[PDB]
Design a protein around this ligand. Structure first.
Ligand SMILES: N[C@H](CCC[C@H](N)C(=O)O)C(=O)O
Ligand SMILES: [Ca+2]
Ligand SMILES: [Ca+2]
Ligand SMILES: [Zn+2]
Ligand SMILES: [Zn+2]
Length: 417
């Protein structure tokens, strides 16, 4: 759970609190890219929006609907030894918090919903591009009229259609009146705790940017109805959403290694150091996005951004010795101390000062075929690199790796600017 809050803590209780959730299925990237964009690019000025950007991360990492079954059928009867039992309890606790008023759950769904059977793509059994409630009213909720909230939100989405076929309609599933499947899903649990709960589905027939667009329209429409004031730092249109999803300023940081850009990495990174005795899902990972993770695939470790594969790591597992904190490097003529885990920009040249017991291997540079080299004490310029060893497709970014005995002391990247 990530809080989207006012900068002043006093303003939290001055408007309602919304819980926003996506990614209960790992192959519905519209939802979890929209929660990501929301987290990265919006501000909430009063009240609070609590966000779980992906409910089923393990499934997301394998581009899979659900590795342990349908997580959205686990809100009623559920076996205590179900692998997702603890996750479900966490989600139910968030939903049931007294401080929460409304819940919004994002999905991607096949085709386009219609109240009347039009054809196999457009009928009441399809889920695409609709806004969903379990009933018209929840007695005892701060905002009991779900139908009014739903219809006004739908108005707001329909003011921005990209094509008429994408028109949004209300789907009231009347869950208590015998809908067995919806009776086991998230939003029904929510209304039973007297929350106004809503679901948005964007059609899978749409490309990602358009799915996300529609999810963000639904979020904005509902926030407007709740009177949770907000801003965003961009114009909401498919192109602006596409640019923010595919944003070259996104980065990820694995363990104590340097920040690396997410987009335009070489597809495979060889001889890549990862801590030994650490399970892949436990390896610390940091990003300015919220849907990034690592996942083991055969012998490789994939870097994932939602359902996108950003690079394949071919790792070697090694002890990460934290003793080395900084290194004396000459950067464009100027000796300075560079902290392990930095990215340093280089206009012309660099040189690493020799160290007692620490050897440095600059990936892409070499003077011999020794497989465990020490390349401290060489003046290195762009011309000295074999470009194919770069981290990036643009051939500007290179790894410098430091070793002490059979331990890994850290990495610095150089970027030629
Ligand atoms: N396509 C979704 C609709 C569920 C909508 C709502 N009941 C929720 O829990 O968000 C499903 O079949 O799980
Ligand atoms: Ca209206
Ligand atoms: Ca995708
Ligand atoms: Zn080298
Ligand atoms: Zn080696």
């Amino acid at each position: 759970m990530i809080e989207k809050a006012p900068t002043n803590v006093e303003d939290r209780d001055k408007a309602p609190h919304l819980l926003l959730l996506a990614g209960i299925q790992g192959d519905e990237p519209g939802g979890f890219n929209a929660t990501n964009l929301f987290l990265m690019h919006y501000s909430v000025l009063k009240g609070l929006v609590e966000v779980v950007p992906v409910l089923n991360k393990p499934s997301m990492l394998r581009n899979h609907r659900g590795l342990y079954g349908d997580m959205n059928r686990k809100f009623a009867a559920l076996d205590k030894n179900d692998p997702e039992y603890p996750t479900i309890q966490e989600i139910k606790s968030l939903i049931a918090k007294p401080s929460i008023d409304a819940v919004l759950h994002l999905h991607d769904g096949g085709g386009y919903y219609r109240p009347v059977y039009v054809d196999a793509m457009l009928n009441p059994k399809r889920w695409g591009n609709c806004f969903i409630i379990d009933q018209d009213e929840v007695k005892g909720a701060k905002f009991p009229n779900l139908l009014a909230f739903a219809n006004n939100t739908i108005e707001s989405i329909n003011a921005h259609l990209l094509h008429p076929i994408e028109e949004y309609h209300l789907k009231n599933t009347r869950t208590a009146q015998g809908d067995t499947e919806m009776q086991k899903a998230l939003t029904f649990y929510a209304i039973n705790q007297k929350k106004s709960a809503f679901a948005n589905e964007a059609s899978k027939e749409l490309p990602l940017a358009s799915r996300v667009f529609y999810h963000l329209q639904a979020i904005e429409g509902l926030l407007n109805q709740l009177n949770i004031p907000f801003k965003r730092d961009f114009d909401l249109n498919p192109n602006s959403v596409h640019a923010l999803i595919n944003d070259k300023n996104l980065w990820a940081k694995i363990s104590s290694l340097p920040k690396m850009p997410l987009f335009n990495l070489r597809p495979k990174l060889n001889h890549f150091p990862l801590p030994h005795n650490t399970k892949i899902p436990q390896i610390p990972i940091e990003s300015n996005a919220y849907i990034v993770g690592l996942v083991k695939n055969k012998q490789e470790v994939f870097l994932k951004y939602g359902n996108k594969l950003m690079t394949r790591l071919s790792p070697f597992y090694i002890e990460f010795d934290p003793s080395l904190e900084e290194v004396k490097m000459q950067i464009d003529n100027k000796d300075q101390m560079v902290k392990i885990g930095s990215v340093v920009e280089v206009k012309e040249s660099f040189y690493i000062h020799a160290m007692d017991n620490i050897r440095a291997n600059v990936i892409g540079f070499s003077v011999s075929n020794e497989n465990k080299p020490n390349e401290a004490g060489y003046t290195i310029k762009f011309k000295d690199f074999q470009k194919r060893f770069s981290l990036d497709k643009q051939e500007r970014i290179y790894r410098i790796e430091f070793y002490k005995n059979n331990a890994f002391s850290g990495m610095i990247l150089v970027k030629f600017v």
